[PDB]
């Protein structure tokens, strides 16, 4: 169950639903039900998750 480092894993049959890959920093594939990816977001594959966003490392903080 290492394969998707997430606390909330939605886990379906396991090959059943669609995943995402978040790139970011990390590049870890989701399940979009498991950080529940908005299909705006799922659409343009853009899926930032929190490490790669507070790791991202800004211009201001
Ligand atoms: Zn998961
Ligand atoms: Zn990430």
Redesign the pocket.
């Known amino acids: 169950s290492h394969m998707?480092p997430?606390v909330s894993?939605?886990?379906p049959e396991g090959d059943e639903v669609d995943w995402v890959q978040c790139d970011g920093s990390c590049n870890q594939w989701?399940?979009q039900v498991?950080?529940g990816v908005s299909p705006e977001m799922a659409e343009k594959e853009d899926y930032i998750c929190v490490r790669c966003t507070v790791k991202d490392a800004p211009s201001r903080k």
């Open positions: 998707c997430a894993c939605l886990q989701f399940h498991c950080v």
